Amino acid sequence: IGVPPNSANLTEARRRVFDFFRAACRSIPTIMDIYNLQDVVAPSQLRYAISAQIRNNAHITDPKVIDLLIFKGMEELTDIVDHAKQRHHIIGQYVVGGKTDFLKNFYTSNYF
Amino acid sequence: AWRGSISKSMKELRILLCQSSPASAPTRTFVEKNYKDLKSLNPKLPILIRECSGVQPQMWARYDMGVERCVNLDGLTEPQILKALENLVKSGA
Amino acid sequence: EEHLSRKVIIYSPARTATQSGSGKLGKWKINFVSTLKWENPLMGWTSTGDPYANVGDSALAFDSEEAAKSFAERHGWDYKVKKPNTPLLKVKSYSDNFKWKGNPQ
Amino acid sequence: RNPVGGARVHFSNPEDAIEVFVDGYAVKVPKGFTVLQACEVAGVDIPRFCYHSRLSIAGNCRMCLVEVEKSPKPVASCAMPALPGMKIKTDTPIAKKAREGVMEFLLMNHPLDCPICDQGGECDLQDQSMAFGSDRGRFTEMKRSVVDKNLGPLVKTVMTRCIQCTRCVRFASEVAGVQDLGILGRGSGEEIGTYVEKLMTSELSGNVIDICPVGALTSKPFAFKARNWELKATETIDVSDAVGSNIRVDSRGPEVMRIIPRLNEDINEEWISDKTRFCYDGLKRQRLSDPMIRDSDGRFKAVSWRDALAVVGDIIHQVKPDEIVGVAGQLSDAESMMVLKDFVNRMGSDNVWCEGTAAGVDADLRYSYLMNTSISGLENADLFLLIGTQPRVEAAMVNARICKTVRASNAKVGYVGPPAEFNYDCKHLGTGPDTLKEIAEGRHPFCTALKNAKNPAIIVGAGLFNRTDKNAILSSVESIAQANNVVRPDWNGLNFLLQYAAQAAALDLGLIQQSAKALESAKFVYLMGADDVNVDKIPKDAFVVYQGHHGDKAVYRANVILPASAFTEKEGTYENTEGFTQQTVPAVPTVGDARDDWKIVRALSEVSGVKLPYNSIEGVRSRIKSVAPNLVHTDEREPAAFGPSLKPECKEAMSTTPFQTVVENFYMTNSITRASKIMAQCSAVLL
Amino acid sequence: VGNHTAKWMQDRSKKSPMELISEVPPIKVDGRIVACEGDTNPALGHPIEFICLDLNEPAICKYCGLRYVQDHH
Amino acid sequence: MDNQFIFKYSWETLPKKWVKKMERSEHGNRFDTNTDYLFQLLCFLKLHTYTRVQVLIDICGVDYPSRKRRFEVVYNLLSTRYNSRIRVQTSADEVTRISSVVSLFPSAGWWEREVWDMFGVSFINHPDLRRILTDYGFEGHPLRKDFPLSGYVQVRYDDPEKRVVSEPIEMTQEFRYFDFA
Numbered sequence A: 001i002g003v004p005p006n007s008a009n010l011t012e013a014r015r016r017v018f019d020f021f022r023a024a025c026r027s028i029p030t031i032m033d034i035y036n037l038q039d040v041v042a043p044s045q046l047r048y049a050i051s052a053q054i055r056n057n058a059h060i061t062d063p064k065v066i067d068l069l070i071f072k073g074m075e076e077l078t079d080i081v082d083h084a085k086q087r088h089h090i091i092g093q094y095v096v097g098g099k100t101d102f103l104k105n106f107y108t109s110n111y112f
Numbered sequence B: 001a002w003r004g005s006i007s008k009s010m011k012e013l014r015i016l017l018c019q020s021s022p023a024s025a026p027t028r029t030f031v032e033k034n035y036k037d038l039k040s041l042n043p044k045l046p047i048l049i050r051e052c053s054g055v056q057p058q059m060w061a062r063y064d065m066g067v068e069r070c071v072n073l074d075g076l077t078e079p080q081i082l083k084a085l086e087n088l089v090k091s092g093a
Numbered sequence C: 001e002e003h004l005s006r007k008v009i010i011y012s013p014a015r016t017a018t019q020s021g022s023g024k025l026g027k028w029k030i031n032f033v034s035t036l037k038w039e040n041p042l043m044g045w046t047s048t049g050d051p052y053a054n055v056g057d058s059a060l061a062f063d064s065e066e067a068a069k070s071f072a073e074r075h076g077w078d079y080k081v082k083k084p085n086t087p088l089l090k091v092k093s094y095s096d097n098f099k100w101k102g103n104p105q
Numbered sequence D: 001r002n003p004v005g006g007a008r009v010h011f012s013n014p015e016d017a018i019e020v021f022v023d024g025y026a027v028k029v030p031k032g033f034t035v036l037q038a039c040e041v042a043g044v045d046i047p048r049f050c051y052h053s054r055l056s057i058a059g060n061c062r063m064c065l066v067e068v069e070k071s072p073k074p075v076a077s078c079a080m081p082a083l084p085g086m087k088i089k090t091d092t093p094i095a096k097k098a099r100e101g102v103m104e105f106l107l108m109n110h111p112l113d114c115p116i117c118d119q120g121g122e123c124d125l126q127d128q129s130m131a132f133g134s135d136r137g138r139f140t141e142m143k144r145s146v147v148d149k150n151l152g153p154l155v156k157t158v159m160t161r162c163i164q165c166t167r168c169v170r171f172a173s174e175v176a177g178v179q180d181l182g183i184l185g186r187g188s189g190e191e192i193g194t195y196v197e198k199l200m201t202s203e204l205s206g207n208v209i210d211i212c213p214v215g216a217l218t219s220k221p222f223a224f225k226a227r228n229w230e231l232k233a234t235e236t237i238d239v240s241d242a243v244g245s246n247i248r249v250d251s252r253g254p255e256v257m258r259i260i261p262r263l264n265e266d267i268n269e270e271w272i273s274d275k276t277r278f279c280y281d282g283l284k285r286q287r288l289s290d291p292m293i294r295d296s297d298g299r300f301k302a303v304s305w306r307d308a309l310a311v312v313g314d315i316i317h318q319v320k321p322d323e324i325v326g327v328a329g330q331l332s333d334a335e336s337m338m339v340l341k342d343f344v345n346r347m348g349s350d351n352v353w354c355e356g357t358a359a360g361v362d363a364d365l366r367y368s369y370l371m372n373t374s375i376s377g378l379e380n381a382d383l384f385l386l387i388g389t390q391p392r393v394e395a396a397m398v399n400a401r402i403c404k405t406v407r408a409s410n411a412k413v414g415y416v417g418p419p420a421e422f423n424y425d426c427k428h429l430g431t432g433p434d435t436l437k438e439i440a441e442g443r444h445p446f447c448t449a450l451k452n453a454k455n456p457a458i459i460v461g462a463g464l465f466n467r468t469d470k471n472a473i474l475s476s477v478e479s480i481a482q483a484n485n486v487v488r489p490d491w492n493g494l495n496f497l498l499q500y501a502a503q504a505a506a507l508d509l510g511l512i513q514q515s516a517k518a519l520e521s522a523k524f525v526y527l528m529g530a531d532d533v534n535v536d537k538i539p540k541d542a543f544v545v546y547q548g549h550h551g552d553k554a555v556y557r558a559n560v561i562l563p564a565s566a567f568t569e570k571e572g573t574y575e576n577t578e579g580f581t582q583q584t585v586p587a588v589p590t591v592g593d594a595r596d597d598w599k600i601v602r603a604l605s606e607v608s609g610v611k612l613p614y615n616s617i618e619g620v621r622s623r624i625k626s627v628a629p630n631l632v633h634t635d636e637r638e639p640a641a642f643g644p645s646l647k648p649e650c651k652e653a654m655s656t657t658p659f660q661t662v663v664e665n666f667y668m669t670n671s672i673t674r675a676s677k678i679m680a681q682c683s684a685v686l687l
Numbered sequence E: 001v002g003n004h005t006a007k008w009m010q011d012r013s014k015k016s017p018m019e020l021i022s023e024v025p026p027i028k029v030d031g032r033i034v035a036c037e038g039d040t041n042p043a044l045g046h047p048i049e050f051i052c053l054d055l056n057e058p059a060i061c062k063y064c065g066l067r068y069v070q071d072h073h
Numbered sequence F: 001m002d003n004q005f006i007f008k009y010s011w012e013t014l015p016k017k018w019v020k021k022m023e024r025s026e027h028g029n030r031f032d033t034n035t036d037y038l039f040q041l042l043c044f045l046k047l048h049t050y051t052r053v054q055v056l057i058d059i060c061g062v063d064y065p066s067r068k069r070r071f072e073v074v075y076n077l078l079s080t081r082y083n084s085r086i087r088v089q090t091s092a093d094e095v096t097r098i099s100s101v102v103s104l105f106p107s108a109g110w111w112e113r114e115v116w117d118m119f120g121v122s123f124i125n126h127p128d129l130r131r132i133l134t135d136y137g138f139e140g141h142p143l144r145k146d147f148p149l150s151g152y153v154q155v156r157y158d159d160p161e162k163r164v165v166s167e168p169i170e171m172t173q174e175f176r177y178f179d180f181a
Ligand code: SF4
Pocket: D110, D111, D112, D113, D114, D115, D117, D118, D119, D120, D121, D123, D124, D125, D126, D161, D213, D214, D215, D216
């Protein structure tokens, strides 16, 4: 229930990472019915989205940073489930459902 | 005779060096001893001597279509710097 | 995320030229170079869509260069440090206003 | 304790230091410092009105009074020399009450017009009244009043506010070098003025606005436009010339409101020229905002960036490589010039240079086109020899340093060139190169004075670099330099004064005109802000592309117009005449659909089929590191590593043509100033 | 009518404040100096302004635009 | 029971390692403790016979970006028994969790939720720690000095989606900062 103490070491922190991954990913069928995503995106694509967010932070070595990231992850998850703000092609922070990149930016504006 | 043909082989020569660092000492002696003769035999060739406070000694040549070749001049003696220039002039030009 | 990769400048604002008092120097600020503003076409008011349009001058201040530098790298902002220019105190004399021109040459 | 404003103190010798006490605390100051300066070292801010660190001491406002032990009277700290064992008290009841009394006298006749006075919000008198003399007013008689005076279109006058500090009078006689302002009359009815009707014609006249502590002398074009608290301050540099004066750009929204000097002891010393201060008006006028290709009826039509770039790229491949020519403008940044040179070189062309007299010069050795003595080092010269240069109109802040040295050190000035008006005494030695032969062969009163000078200084204008006999002239100049021992390991007195902000970086990067007639045989011309080139030499059938933010004649000839950002709207690299490299800082957004200059060239190169190895400005600067590494080592002072000995011997015969004048109109020098209402007014009356 | 007034005044039925203040003739003063308060009751006017009348041209109060001239010389 | 007695009595009776700084002033007596001793010190003040600090008035954070521990957590406390007030403070950074005092003072619950919402400071053993003031799904902690006044997003009704939606901000007139310094 309560906010746990900071994880002592990386084994403790990574153990907490897997519980968050399990809890966040287990709630995909609830999210699918809440946002009516049956004809929009497959459950696996949102599972791979969560895994990708976790992998993008695999380089963090401070257990206290990991604890804060998990806590913010639980809060992001809770707001998505409990108080849904349904857009069309996003949930929360994540989008759902011959020239280099300089000319495209150049044609758009002067601020890159 | 190649020292009279740098105008016909490359469009521009650049020598980068440090004003005081010992690593740039051979390059400075090379500039102080050879620039007078090189410019005299190649009056229409820009030989740009650009000194900076913390750069490794370098040499650059600019041929056709802005194609460029560079040589690291660190750990070289002054006759070897003269040799590296002759390779730049005679090859790739 | 997207706002964390902007380039900033860490700098100490110089003294103004319209006042001889020096009681604002020593401060260090992070310039967010927010230079995207335009005119609203109903009144001509200055419109902007940059969240960091005024935070760098209003609220974000640092008492030292090191403090400003450490905060930028913790936030991920790529910064450049501009050292401030300082005056050179030179010897002045009221007596110099009456210096002898010397023997008529 | 930290000195006030972080002021640096330099000691000639530790033995030449004395000890003083400021409010008990102990400080070590050089011999000759005044009591006020010792207070500054001790981190104590003494109020002052008439004292200015760059002007002679006056001691008339009496606001700097402090208590000195064993002294019967309060001491004017700005004027009194500090002595060993001196005990200085700045917050005792005598000092506090003396300040209160003087402040009451200052406000006695001062007009009640803070709401209509532009100094409000940045006024020393308001602040020192708040802090020191917090005395309720008890003056109930009639105030004096003064009529206003006309000093020209730049300086607005409200003389009721004047507190007779005489800073403006002393500036006119010690810095500006033009004695027009004086103090007329006697008593409380003394008035600052010119007596006869006349306008301030000095190019440094706008600095009296900064030094006037009250709203008596204010900027006329800025009048009533804004309050200081609503202005955003940007710390940048000036591009009006090759001096790189440090400035502060004040803006409100997407508009520059005013430009004021910024402290830089080595360059401009908190002064700027009138062109630098009053050219900001042209930044919002006649701006190129959209890409534009001329239509069938020979009239321009706005298009997108894609359509405009395709038109230029499509036609660049229908011309021979040797017929491609690119000219960089006088306001071009180092990044844009490097990309221009890279693009032109990969299009098989070798014709890229910077507009101006120094277009086809020998840039091999950096000494040959830089002020090697340095602006701050000019103060150590006991003799100036100016050859073919008018510094007063070419580099005003450099000329200011020379005047300052002549008044203080009694240095002598020899001038060779067309007749010109100098703001300091100077012997006119001649107008053409025959004097250089005359100087070289000796037998002249100035020839022996040059030989008798300990640290001589020769300054040669860049306007003598487009002459037919530049080599012969520079050969003669070096012979005079070597003969008189002008260049030594302890003193480098040979200088070359460039005229354009872009020239120093262009020569470092390699932008040298090879073919003297490459323009008259061009089929593709890329004008990167080069509005000052003569465009009649371009063949009538040659594709011309103009990229810039303004334009008068090149816009008329261009087939395609590419709008570009100005120096107040981007981060660019600029090098001044002394090899000092600095960077601008963006202050306001760009106007219309304009783009940064290097972005247009990099974008146009990809459209033309050339791949450059950079996408961001950081890639361009790393590329510049391979060419001119000093261009990316910003804000670093570096001595020259090689000298005139490496120059080949030259045997050309000198011509007889007298030297010409480079800058005909000081106020109309670039495309920004030519789009300025104020610079137009100055050319009408101030010239 | 001027460019300054045209920025905000889109109604041409009435005269602008600039033309209205130009119509009131200069006030003649016996002496070289006059104090203007902008109102008969000073507390309801503008901050007191002292105006020198040494010039031949009418002298303008910088707050309210009233003009003053020397009566005799 | 004036501020002189509390300052002198606390110095004699408190464990020495608990307090790093003690200030007596007319602006309020103030003990600066280390993070690991905050809970025990507050329990001592509440239970001890000669202090009886029974009421937790509020908990607030202060941001000091120039400090390596930018946040300062201030506890304002009142003793109705002795008619006296005491201030206890501690420092924290963006990742250091600190002890919750809900078990000592139930009123701390919402105030600790506000500190987390406004500053991002987390509280060990807090029973229900979530945002309390900001909109659901809010990113950032607005009372931090670096957080912009107008934030990052704004809301409006979007007819095609038939709902209220969040978009990045676009101001008709930007907030004008007036520098009077
Ligand atoms: S100079 Fe202007 S702002 Fe300063 S006290 Fe006088 S009227 Fe007021």
